[PDB]
Amino acid sequence: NLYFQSMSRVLQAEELHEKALDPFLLQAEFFEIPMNFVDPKEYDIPGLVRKNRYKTILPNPHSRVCLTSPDPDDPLSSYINANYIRGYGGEEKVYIATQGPIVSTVADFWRMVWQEHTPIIVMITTEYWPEEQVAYDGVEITVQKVIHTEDYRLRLISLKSEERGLKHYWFTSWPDQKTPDRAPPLLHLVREVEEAAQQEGPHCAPIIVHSSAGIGRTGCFIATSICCQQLRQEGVVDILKTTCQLRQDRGGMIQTCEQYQFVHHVMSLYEKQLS
């Protein structure tokens, strides 16, 4: 309850299915949740203008990812528009939510990937990866394989500087209409990424998730991911509490009520699948 009082509504299956189909209640509930955006004046850093895609969408200071190499004491060098995000049950640093890299932040993005030992990137739609190979700040980035599926493209990537693997999931099927029939692809991606995460073994490093601003579709993906574990482990989902937790970590996570309803559609579907 750092910036604001968290709210909760624990949904068992019956209520979950009905809740997903009550837009009047969904909007009432959603617009009670503070956005928790940071005042841009909190950052007074020359050159910061080049680092943000949107001037009013900035990382909450307490959870921002600081880039500690090569100049941790320089505000601009240490800056990236990205926040550590708690996962299911409040587990620290399960994800990093960040804006889609822009021309001026591609190298910064890779600095973060290397710093955090990130095993997986989830991209939801600048092409910041090479066609074959490119090097930033001492780390050689090689795309070893491209795997095309119905709804995403998966790149298997080598990072060498010490060699590490990286899985890059590019989800292209973000629906214009957030209707129940559009839920399955997002659910499938969420479950694929869960499996990939588990395959990394103990003490998994943060999973990077991005979209243009890194709040709306990024928030939907992460909320759904968290709630899937909750459903399997507890037999309930608390989308309201999860959304509150996300907002405490990064202002604006889940931007629209249509997105909020979509998360309910996805969870209702998953409950049916599990049942």
Residue numbers in the entry: -7 to -1, 258 to 375, 385 to 420, 423 to 536
The paper states:
Protein tyrosine phosphatases (PTPs) play a critical role in regulating cellular functions by selectively dephosphorylating their substrates. The ∼280 residue PTP catalytic domain consists of an α/β structure, and biochemical and structural studies have led to a detailed understanding of the catalytic mechanism (Barford et al., 1994; Zhang, 2002). Key features of the domain include the PTP signature motif, the mobile Trp-Pro-Asp “WPD” loop that in the closed conformation positions the conserved and catalytically important aspartate residue, and the phosphotyrosine recognition loop.
The atypically open state is associated in STEP with a stabilizing 310 helix C-terminal to the WPD loop (Eswaran et al., 2006) and in LYP and GLEPP1 an extra turn of helix α3 following the WPD loop. The observation of an open substrate complex and closed apo structures (Pedersen et al., 2004) raises the question of the mechanism that triggers loop closure. In contrast, in structures with an open or atypical WPD loop conformation this water molecule was not observed or was significantly displaced, suggesting that it is a key part of the closure mechanism. This scenario is present in the R7 group phosphatases (PCPTP, STEP, and HEPTP).
